[PDB]
DNA sequence: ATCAATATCCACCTGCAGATTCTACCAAAAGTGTATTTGGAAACTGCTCCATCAAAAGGCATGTTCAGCGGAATTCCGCTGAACATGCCTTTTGATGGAGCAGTTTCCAAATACACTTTTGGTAGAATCTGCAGGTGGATATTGAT
DNA sequence: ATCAATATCCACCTGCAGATTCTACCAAAAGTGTATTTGGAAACTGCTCCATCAAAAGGCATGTTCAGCGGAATTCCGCTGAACATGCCTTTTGATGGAGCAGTTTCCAAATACACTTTTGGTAGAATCTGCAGGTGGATATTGAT
């Protein structure tokens, strides 16, 4: 009965995903959200396949970087577990809450 | 056969006639000098070479011959200056640079 | 719900590419809310460019133009 | 539908004769050239207006470049530029 | 001659606060505000028109620009005020 | 002979703005409605910020609006604060604000 | 002898300066710093007095906003004392060296 | 004075009391001793960058005098738009 | 130190999806040859305001003492996230009508362009006006020792 | 809580510099009125490519177990905030010479402006190749338990 210790697989995932470039969010679900959010701005809309793709590419690129800054904030407070206050602080200094 | 292109005169690969056309129809000024499209095309060609040269090496370094997005990202974010110039740009399918904060590594 | 369609495993994967080793249980919800605000801001601008051009189809360029205005310039889909 | 794709390819072959490039990569390059063009042209526009001038010249393109590009990159961009205008001006 | 939106800022000032004045440094800031917003809007109009292969900037471009630039309520009211002014200017004859 | 501002029922100069549009090279042509619509939007916005600056002055027992008044009006209003989130109003100071943990 | 407890005069000062708008850096000294840097950049330059005031106005608005962000980074660490690490965290997130 | 002298080490003109006052308006209650030198460093880089562009705008206008507009345009470029000096 | 279980590399193989070399019809470019126009440099110069020297005085920077208390280091102990493998739902993949996105033709309302004519927003120069900055006293807090 | 030291609050009060007030000239605007030109909306349409339906494909939700991380409590010290003494250098008020900035007329190199001719860069349907990504196989490093 084998088992990897806490964090050993996490580190492994970090290594894997920083090597690759594939989108990490499942497309269909992402597309639903996009369309849903849009319907609030103009009813009965169509989307070029590439329009949805540009938005997903932009969104993951954004979140990933926000996860980088969040990590730095957790670490600044001598932790290794990112928390909401960490995301809040980052966006706040980014001026996204200013 | 003869009428020589402006790009060939300036000894450039980039289209001077087009850069000139694009400056005019761009509404940047009432008039556009003759040298501007030349100078500007020269600058775009140079920068284009700068990135391709670096992205090419990233391709070599990966035992690959065809330059893909990943290669371009690796070339940009690894160059202090190019990285600064594209500090607020996102290269689709570029991924990030491999990087793990030390304090997150297993305590050897 | 759709926003809930952005699953824990996916958010965790993003965090990973971002270099995160340990993730608090409350991050997931927090993240969606952030992702939601992002999309609203961007889509709202894209759709404004769609209507301006009297169209019923948002185009990659409408998104690219939006992104540029948000200071989120994207290479790969035009402009 | 114009694009800098061919000239991008030509420059590629001078730098890495045996290296190719994927579409998605070519698309990224294209965006790159348009972005820089817009940034440089725009500054040159402001430059002229600030000085109540009706014309955008090589002068304006150079300063625009000094303001936009990082140190060393700017240095070379200025030379390449100056070179091309000279060669051009010295040709029947 | 150096033009300023000053006399116009002052007229409006008297409309909203009949007995209030403004220091020149405050007026100076106000003049910068009017120029700044003008440029952002015209700028947006400029691009909006190019993205559409349109050589003309109309009241319509100015409107989408305003929509893109100003926050919620400000945008709602500005569009209204501008529409209103065009409609009226239109009807003088 | 009436001005276009009067014709439009505006206080801001419709001619100056139509003129400025041209000289700024934003397009080949500038329609007649553009300057009218823009002069209105410009006017509407200065009214808003002057309304709020005037109140700030009043609150600080002042008759003449000064920079700090403009700064308080902008930073205290969400929309304006957002519209000017990267603008620096010289001689405006900051809004009084002390984080909780710093108190006794 | 009367003596205010440590931190009382500090809050007094915060309320004092947050209630005012005059510049806080001595004028002449700031001007020399401007001339020194400009000079070690291009000799023989002159300055409109208002160009130096515009620079001081912007530099003080810049530093004050930076100290706020720094203050937040320190409190994030459960501290009340700002340290270089805080100033650095804020600038890295702000994208001034990220 | 009798004169024409060398500018040198003026960054120290940004005194500790003056930096403290700035942190105060910034709502800061306690300051570590290492903050002052770090602040001078941050200020110097800020200035070098605005002056570099401003002075670039001056040269382009073939002038010897840096104007407030030069500084105002340099600030806009840098995303730090300034109101009150002509822009 | 000694295995035992896994994850990680690697060298080789190969099918095909995306990269490419070819052909040709061609309109939008781009180059070219001539006549016309004009922006902005050179040259003269009026006059703003920038550099600078001067003197005085008090707001403030500097430097020291002293000890309160904030920061860090250390021990502790719940509880919360990570690892996991258990069984199933949604997503991804590939094929078919249709509604819009464009390519085209048209003609009219609207925007130049231009020659006057008239009204206005700037200005520098005289002079009076007026909010408030900053000095003052003393009455209401706010602090901190006891 | 009561009490003494101090800071803050604040309405009263007038000289001063910054704001509001004309009288003037005004050419630069902005408006007025043809004449010429055209951009783009509107109608009609043909091919894309976008939305949707079926199905074979595979990453996620769920419950359990527990080690390890993060916050609480305790402790010690050295550093940073008050407070105070001393004195210089910044701030202020003025004047002075002259460097440049900015105004004005002048006029040629360079730029707009068609018109004419050549050609290249993009679209398209066809045909062919080829870099490499999954896939296999076996070696070996990593990780974790004892």
Here the tokens at position G57 are: 């106005």
Q: Is H31 helix (H, G, I), strand (E, B) or coil?
A: strand
> E67 to chain C: which residues are within 8 Å by CB?
48
> Closest Cα to residue F37, out of E80, E44, E71, E74?
E80
Q: Is A82 helix (H, G, I), strand (E, B) or coil?
A: strand
Here the tokens at position F92 are: 């405006």
CATH number at residue B70: 1.10.20.10
Q: Is G47 helix (H, G, I), strand (E, B) or coil?
A: strand
Find out whether H78 and H61 touch, Cβ atoms under 8 Å: no
Find out whether C24 and A54 touch, Cβ atoms under 8 Å: no
Q: Is C70 helix (H, G, I), strand (E, B) or coil?
A: coil
Give the 3-state DSSP-derived string for B30-62, with helices as H, strands as E and coil as C. Answer: CEECCHHHHHHHHHHHHHHHHHHHHHHHHHHCC
Q: Please, which contacts does B84-89 make with residues 24 or more away whose CB atoms are closer than 8 Å?
A: B84/D70, B85/D68, B85/D69, B85/D70, B85/D73, B86/D32, B87/G95, B88/C71, B88/C72, B88/C73, B89/C73, B89/C74, B89/C75, B89/D35
Do D51 and H73 lie within an 8 Å CB cutoff? no
Backbone angles phi, psi at A54, to 5 degrees: -60, -45
Taking the C-alpha atoms of residue F49 and residue E16, their distance in angstroms, rounded to an integer, is: 10
Q: Using CB atoms, which residue from B38, B67, B80 is nearest to D22?
A: B67
CA of G84 to C1' of J77 (A): 22
From H40's Cα to the closest Cα of chain D, the distance in A is: 23
Give the 3-state DSSP-derived string for B50-104, with helices as H, strands as E and coil as C. Answer: HHHHHHHHHHHCCCCCEECHHHHHHHHCCCHHHHHHCCCCEECCCCCCCCCCHHH
Find out whether A76 and G73 touch, Cβ atoms under 8 Å: yes
CA of D56 to C1' of J112 (A): 14
CA A40 from chain centre, in angstroms, equals: 23
> Closest Cα to residue H14, out of G85, G63, G41?
G63
Resolution in A, one decimal? 2.7
Q: Is D39 helix (H, G, I), strand (E, B) or coil?
A: helix
Q: Where do breaks (C to N over 2.5 Å) occur in chain H, by preceding residue number?
A: none
Domain count, chain F: 1
From G72's Cα to the closest Cα of chain A, the distance in A is: 8
CATH number at residue C2: 1.10.20.10
Number of alpha carbons in the 13 Å side-chain half-sphere of residue F33:
18
Do E85 and F69 lie within an 8 Å CB cutoff? no
DSSP character at residue G85:
H
- Name C74's bridge partners: B90
> Closest Cα to residue A58, out of C17, G98, C31, C72?
C72
Range of the domain at F50: 1-104
Find out whether E63 and F37 touch, Cβ atoms under 8 Å: yes
Taking the C-alpha atoms of residue F46 and residue H57, their distance in angstroms, rounded to an integer, is: 30
Neighbours of chain H (3+ CB pairs under 8 A): D, E, F, G
Taking the C-alpha atoms of residue A81 and residue C24, their distance in angstroms, rounded to an integer, is: 6
**Which of E44, E48, E61 has the highest number of chain C CBs within 10 A, making it the mutation to test binding with C?**
E48
Instruction: Tell whether C79 is within 8 A of chain A (Cβ).
Output: no
CATH 3.30.930.10 fits G1-98, yes or no: no
> Residues 6 or more apart from C12 whose CB is under 8 A from it?
C23
Do C79 and D35 lie within an 8 Å CB cutoff? yes
Instruction: Tell whether H87 is within 8 A of chain E (Cβ).
Output: yes
> Closest Cα to residue A48, out of E52, B92, C77, C58?
C58
- Only one residue has tokens 């804020």, namely G90
From C29's Cα to the closest Cα of chain A, the distance in A is: 9
> Closest Cα to residue A74, out of A66, A83, A65?
A83
CA dist E77 to C52, E14, F40, F42, Å? 19, 21, 11, 12
Do G87 and H48 lie within an 8 Å CB cutoff? no
CA of C56 to C1' of J125 (A): 31
In strand I, the nucleotides that come within 7 Å of a protein beta carbon are 5-8, 18-20, 29-32, 39-40, 49-54, 60-62, 68-72, 80-85, 90-93, 99-102, 110-112, 118-123, 131-133, 143-145
Find out whether G82 and H32 touch, Cβ atoms under 8 Å: yes
CATH class assigned to D1-92:
mainly alpha
From E5's Cα to the closest Cα of chain C, the distance in A is: 28
> B26 to chain E: which residues are within 8 Å by CB?
50
Neighbours of chain A (3+ CB pairs under 8 A): B, C, G
Instruction: Tell whether F3 is within 8 A of chain E (Cβ).
Output: no
Q: How many helices (H) and strands (E) does chain A have?
A: 4, 2
Instruction: Tell whether B102 is within 8 A of chain C (Cβ).
Output: no
What fold does the segment set E1-93 form as a domain?
Histone, subunit A (1.10.20)
Range of the domain at C10: 1-79
Taking the C-alpha atoms of residue B56 and residue D18, their distance in angstroms, rounded to an integer, is: 10
Query: Given the DSSP bridges, would you call strands F87-89 and H30-31 parallel, antiparallel or unpaired?
Result: unpaired
CA of E71 to C1' of J131 (A): 50
Do D50 and H73 lie within an 8 Å CB cutoff? yes
């Amino acid at each position: 009965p084998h088992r990897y210790r806490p964090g050993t697989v996490a580190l492994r995932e970090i290594r894997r995903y920083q090597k690759s470039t594939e989108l990490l969010i499942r497309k269909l679900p992402f597309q639903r959200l996009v369309r849903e959010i849009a319907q609030d701005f103009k009813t009965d809309l169509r989307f070029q396949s590439s329009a949805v793709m540009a938005l997903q590419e932009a969104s993951e690129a954004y979140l990933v970087a926000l996860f980088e800054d969040t990590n730095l904030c957790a670490i600044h407070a001598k932790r290794v577990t990112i928390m909401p206050k960490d995301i809040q602080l980052a966006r706040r200094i980014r001026g996204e809450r200013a | 056969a003869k009428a020589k292109t402006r790009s060939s005169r300036a000894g450039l690969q980039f289209p001077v006639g087009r850069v000139h056309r694009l400056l005019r129809k761009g509404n940047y000024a009432e008039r556009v000098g003759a040298g501007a499209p030349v100078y500007l095309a020269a600058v775009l060609e140079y920068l284009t070479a700068e990135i391709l040269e670096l992205a090419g090496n990233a391709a070599r370094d990966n035992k690959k011959t065809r330059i893909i997005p990943r290669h371009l990202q690796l070339a940009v974010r690894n160059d202090e200056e190019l990285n600064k110039l594209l500090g607020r740009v996102t290269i689709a399918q570029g991924g990030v640079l491999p990087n793990i904060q030390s304090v997150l590594l297993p305590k050897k | 719900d759709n926003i809930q369609g952005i699953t824990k495993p996916a958010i965790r994967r993003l965090a990973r590419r971002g270099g995160v080793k340990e993730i608090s249980g409350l991050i997931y919800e927090e993240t969606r809310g952030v992702l939601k605000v992002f999309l609203e801001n961007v889509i709202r601008d894209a759709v404004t460019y769609t209507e301006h051009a009297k169209r019923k189809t948002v185009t990659a360029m409408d998104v690219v133009y939006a992104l540029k205005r948000q200071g989120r310039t994207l290479y790969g889909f035009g402009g | 539908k114009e694009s800098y794709a061919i000239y991008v390819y030509k420059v590629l072959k001078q730098v890495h004769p045996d290296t190719g490039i994927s579409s998605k990569a070519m698309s990224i390059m294209n965006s790159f050239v348009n972005d820089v063009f817009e940034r440089i042209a725009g500054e040159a526009s402001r430059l002229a207006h600030y000085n109540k001038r009706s014309t955008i010249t090589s002068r304006e393109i150079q300063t625009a470049v000094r303001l936009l590009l990082p140190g060393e990159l700017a240095k070379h961009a200025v030379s390449e530029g100056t070179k091309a205008v000279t060669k051009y001006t010295s040709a029947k």
